[PDB]
Design an enzyme around this catalytic site. Sequence first.
Site, short mmCIF file in Angstrom:
data_model
loop_
_atom_site.label_atom_id
_atom_site.label_comp_id
_atom_site.label_asym_id
_atom_site.label_seq_id
_atom_site.Cartn_x
_atom_site.Cartn_y
_atom_site.Cartn_z
N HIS A 189 0.91 -0.97 -0.03
CA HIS A 189 -0.02 0.10 0.06
C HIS A 189 0.86 1.37 0.01
CE1 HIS A 189 0.44 -0.64 4.42
NE2 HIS A 189 0.63 0.90 4.29
N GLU A 214 0.00 -8.15 0.39
CA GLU A 214 0.17 -6.92 1.06
C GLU A 214 1.91 -6.81 0.75
OE1 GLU A 214 -1.97 -4.99 1.31
OE2 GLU A 214 -0.43 -3.32 1.70
N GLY A 245 2.76 6.52 11.11
CA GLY A 245 3.38 5.81 10.19
C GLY A 245 4.32 4.87 10.37
N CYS A 256 4.27 1.51 9.27
CA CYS A 256 4.47 0.66 8.11
C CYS A 256 5.55 1.14 7.57
CB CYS A 256 3.24 0.74 7.13
SG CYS A 256 1.67 -0.06 7.87
N1 LIG Z 1 1.93 3.52 8.57
C1 LIG Z 1 1.33 2.82 7.86
C2 LIG Z 1 0.22 2.24 7.26
O1 LIG Z 1 -0.29 2.81 6.18
C3 LIG Z 1 -0.99 1.83 8.10
C4 LIG Z 1 -0.81 1.18 9.62
C5 LIG Z 1 -2.23 1.04 10.43
C6 LIG Z 1 -3.09 2.02 10.41
C7 LIG Z 1 -4.39 2.05 11.16
C8 LIG Z 1 -4.00 1.69 12.70
N2 LIG Z 1 -3.14 0.80 12.89
C9 LIG Z 1 -1.97 0.54 11.82
O2 LIG Z 1 -0.91 -0.03 11.97
N3 LIG Z 1 -1.59 0.76 7.58
C10 LIG Z 1 -2.74 0.82 6.94
O3 LIG Z 1 -3.03 2.15 6.68
C11 LIG Z 1 -3.37 -0.08 6.20
C12 LIG Z 1 -3.07 0.18 4.49
C13 LIG Z 1 -3.85 -1.16 3.75
C14 LIG Z 1 -4.75 -0.61 2.84
C15 LIG Z 1 -5.19 -1.72 2.01
C16 LIG Z 1 -4.59 -3.22 2.29
C17 LIG Z 1 -3.91 -3.50 3.34
C18 LIG Z 1 -3.43 -2.37 3.93
N4 LIG Z 1 -4.71 -0.15 6.38
C19 LIG Z 1 -5.29 -0.67 7.69
O4 LIG Z 1 -4.17 -0.78 8.56
C20 LIG Z 1 -6.72 -0.40 8.03
C21 LIG Z 1 -7.40 -2.03 7.73
C22 LIG Z 1 -8.76 -2.09 8.39
C23 LIG Z 1 -9.40 -1.34 8.68
C24 LIG Z 1 -10.70 -1.44 9.46
C25 LIG Z 1 -10.93 -2.86 9.65
C26 LIG Z 1 -10.28 -3.78 9.20
C27 LIG Z 1 -9.17 -3.55 8.27
#
Ligand SMILES: N#C[C@H](O)[C@H](C[C@@H]1CCCNC1=O)NC(=O)[C@H](Cc1ccccc1)NC(=O)/C=C/c1ccccc1
Length: 180
Positions: free
Chosen positions: A40, A71, A145, A147
């Site tokens: 992503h 992913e 952030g 990730c």
């Molecule tokens: N930095 C950074 C990343 O962009 C961040 C970390 C997240 C954010 C939220 C809070 N906790 C975390 O660690 N991941 C992200 O933002 C990922 C990005 C993604 C998009 C599409 C497919 C796979 C991953 N998205 C997510 O983590 C959210 C997925 C979700 C939300 C509600 C219910 C079930 C699942």
Amino acid sequence: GPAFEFAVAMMKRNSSTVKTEYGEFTMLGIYDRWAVLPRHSKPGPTILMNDQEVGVLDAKELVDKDGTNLELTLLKLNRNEKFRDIRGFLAKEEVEVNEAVLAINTSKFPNMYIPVGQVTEYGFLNLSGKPTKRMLMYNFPTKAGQCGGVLMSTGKVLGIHIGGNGRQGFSAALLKHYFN
Ligand SMILES: N#C[C@H](O)[C@H](C[C@@H]1CCCNC1=O)NC(=O)[C@H](Cc1ccccc1)NC(=O)/C=C/c1ccccc1
């Protein structure tokens, strides 16, 4: 314990801070000039690797044998330096440990290590529509952030942090066969 000791050296040797149109991420170099990013992060023709433009010769968004998302995105980088071949630290199949360490190197979270506790083979997850597989779960309220920080243990690199739901945090398992 030596989990940390192991992790600092990994991040020192093979890690970098990457910026893309989609934000700031942690990047891990695997071998040669290949690295991984959370899918992503959607790196285009170039990326900011530690604030310099490194070109991306090739990029494979990794998927199942079923085509299902994983992913993980593999990057061939256009730079001279080779990474250290850390494939010897990658498992052949998803790993569960009771004690594990998450490591981030972004500008918001520079060089920080987290005793995250227990990793379990969570398996499937629907991540914002995208159904992804081979997930590793841990009970830590991660965020952006962080990730794609690196998930490690004593002499293991387990996966790459790709998501979180505000209470748990998930990593794409990082298996050997992803790299010949
Ligand atoms: N930095 C950074 C990343 O962009 C961040 C970390 C997240 C954010 C939220 C809070 N906790 C975390 O660690 N991941 C992200 O933002 C990922 C990005 C993604 C998009 C599409 C497919 C796979 C991953 N998205 C997510 O983590 C959210 C997925 C979700 C939300 C509600 C219910 C079930 C699942």
